[PDB]
Amino acid sequence: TFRRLWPTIAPFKAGLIVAGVALILNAASDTFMLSLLKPLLDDGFGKTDRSVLVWMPLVVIGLMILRGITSYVSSYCISWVSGKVVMTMRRRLFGHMMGMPVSFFDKQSTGTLLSRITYDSEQVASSSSGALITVVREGASIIGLFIMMFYYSWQLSIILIVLAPIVSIAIRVVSKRFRNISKNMQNTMGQVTTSAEQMLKGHKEVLIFGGQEVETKRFDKVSNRMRLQGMKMVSASSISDPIIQLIASLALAFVLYAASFPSVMDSLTAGTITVVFSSMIALMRPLKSLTNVNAQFQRGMAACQTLFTILDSEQEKDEGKRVIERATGDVEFRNVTFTYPGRDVPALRNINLKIPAGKTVALVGRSGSGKSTIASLITRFYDIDEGEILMDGHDLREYTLASLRNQVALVSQNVHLFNDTVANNIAYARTEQYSREQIEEAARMAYAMDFINKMDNGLDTVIGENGVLLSGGQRQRIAIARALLRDSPILILDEATSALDTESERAIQAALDELQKNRTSLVIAHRLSTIEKADEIVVVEDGVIVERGTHNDLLEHRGVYAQLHKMQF
């Protein structure tokens, strides 16, 4: 079907061949243990007394240490190639889902996207290789049980191949007829049940009119009708199994009658009838399991398309070659509007904001404007439908994604901690380039050394989740230390932190001043210090900016930001 997957299995097909060789030896031990019923009964019990009952017990054991060694060698070699293909494809999904647009992660999929490398990726090898186990076992124990019936007694087996289909089609006809007789009876049962429901609903009408005696008499015959129509879907469902069992037993009677004729019984005996009639019983399970072998391989490969779509989806756009070494320039928004991919209401209207070099600008949007959305466009997480953002005089779309994003740091509250010791969590993606002494100086400059010195291993202690689990106040300043080390020219402050606790706010502000000393800082304003010290203030009500004026005039004249300040104070 979608078996472009095979190229990722062929490198490990040597495991599949072993697990197939050890799967026809597991199936040839199912039919070589039924074949013992011939020596057991014909030769070991009836014909004589001994000599076959002291040899066979160990052949039952020795055919179950070969059924338990080929049921494990065939479950380890289809669990090694089914684990090395759910690893060369779990690791290609993640090699894609770490270089594609945030839109996909924008709650288009959050937790189900771990179900596409943990569940819908192990259902591509727990069902596309569980449909090779049951097309080489049950499919080699069907063949294995046809060179056994036709070898012990072909005359009797060929009958069982003629009556098997007739019996099966007759049983299917009867069963479907009685599944249709019953089905059209449940319709009437539902009609009467709905009629009773039409009685319960009018409870108030029954009460007020004094009909508690008339209504209960109309249930004396609506409940006596869902009985008689309930005694007839059990007089039509319990009359099916007797009929199908009688049909099946008629074929047993016919086979036994055929064996009575001298032309069949000569080479039949009492042991060659048990290996033939007790393998067709053993031939039911294989044939039943073979039916669900294209309803698995199309279920375990239907999940190989939900993720082969992700594996070839559109990654982030790198259509640009304007790299930058250090962005020592202004940031300007020109006719910039933005809409959430997947939404029709434009999140941003006409925006014209400039961030001069070295000078910080602050945003006040306490009314849920979406100030967070403008902060995302500068880093090119999102793409703007219309407008242009010029950094150093050139639009970001011309800028290469890697270099553009290298020159900006998201210093925010909800930062993410990597499950690694906090020395690459500070020099992340640059641990090779930056020495430990530089990391120490960065932590000292941001004054973040206090949290890391108090913990156990010092600086080489795992800081990520499911580990030390440092508090939000401590988590915040690790990002400031990161920025101090990577020296991003542009700063994107969130400042959503509402924590006023001492030992948190004092150090946070101390490191914030150092970071913004000489950084073009777009701030999401919630603190008074940055509001009153920022070179430019902008208040955004919704979409377009309403007042692009500095703090003095904005505060003095009411406008909009002064109302939000009255809310502040």
Footprint of a copy of itself on 59-78 (CB under 8 A): 60-61, 64-65, 67-69, 71-72, 75-76
Angle at 96 between CA 92 and CA 99, to 5 degrees: 145
Select the residue interacting with a copy of itself from 122, 332, 495, 536 (CB under 8 A).
122
Select the residue interacting with a copy of itself from 18, 170, 268, 293 (CB under 8 A).
268
Smallest CA-to-CA distance from 320 within 408, 387, 380, 385 is with: 380
Q: How far is the CB of 108 from a copy of itself (least distance, A)?
A: 10
Nearer to a copy of itself by Cβ, of 214 and 499: the residue is 214
349 is in an annotated binding site: no
* Contact indicator for 543, 346 with CB cutoff of 8 Å: yes
Which residues sit opposite 321 in a β-bridge?
none
Select the residue interacting with a copy of itself from 21, 164, 171, 199 (CB under 8 A).
199
CB atoms within 10 A of CB 427: 20
Q: Is 402 in the site for a copy of itself (CB under 8 A)?
A: yes
Task: Tell whether the torsion through CA atoms of 250, 251, 252 and 258 is positive or negative.
Answer: positive
Residue 536 dihedral angles phi and psi, to the nearest 5° = -130, 140
Q: How far is the CB of 372 from a copy of itself (least distance, A)?
A: 12
| Among 2-10, 104-112, 447-455, 517-525, the segment contacting a copy of itself (CB under 8 A) | 104-112
Nearer to a copy of itself by Cβ, of 411 and 511: the residue is 411
* Bridge pairing between strands 520-524 and 361-364: parallel
Q: Is 30 in the site for a copy of itself (CB under 8 A)?
A: no
Close Cβ partners of 309 (under 8 Å, ≥ 6 residues apart): none
- Rounded Cα–Cα distance for residues 471 and 422 (Å): 14
Residues 486-525: x where in contact with a copy of itself by CB under 8 A, - otherwise, as a string: x---------------------------------------
DSSP state of 7: G
Nearer to a copy of itself by Cβ, of 63 and 555: the residue is 63
DSSP class per residue in 209-265: TT-HHHHHHHHTTTTTHHHHTTSSSSTTTTTTHHHHHHHHHHHHHHHHHHHHSHHHH
Pick out residues in 339-398 that bind a copy of itself (CB under 8 A).
379, 381
Tokens (6 digits) for 523: 């701030």
Alpha-helical (H) ranges within 43-153 are 56-62, 73-76, 90-96, 102-103, 130-133, 149-152
Q: Is 423 in the site for a copy of itself (CB under 8 A)?
A: no
Select the residue interacting with a copy of itself from 18, 171, 181, 206 (CB under 8 A).
206
Tokens (6 digits) for 328: 């020592």
Residues 445-484: x where in contact with a copy of itself by CB under 8 A, - otherwise, as a string: -------------------xxx---------------x--
Nearer to a copy of itself by Cβ, of 175 and 350: the residue is 175
Smallest CA-to-CA distance from 116 within 134, 94, 133, 101 is with: 94
Q: Is 48 in the site for a copy of itself (CB under 8 A)?
A: yes
Q: How far is the CB of 557 from a copy of itself (least distance, A)?
A: 37
Pick out residues in 225-254 that bind a copy of itself (CB under 8 A).
226-228, 230-231, 234-235, 238-239, 241-243, 245-246, 249-250, 252-254
Select the residue interacting with a copy of itself from 256, 284, 295, 528 (CB under 8 A).
256
Q: Is 118 in the site for a copy of itself (CB under 8 A)?
A: yes
Select the residue interacting with a copy of itself from 4, 288, 416, 533 (CB under 8 A).
416
Q: How far is the CB of 532 from a copy of itself (least distance, A)?
A: 29
Neighbour-count burial of 153, counting CB atoms closer than 10 A to its CB (0-12 exposed, 13-18 middle, 19+ buried): buried
Binding residues for ATP: 365-372
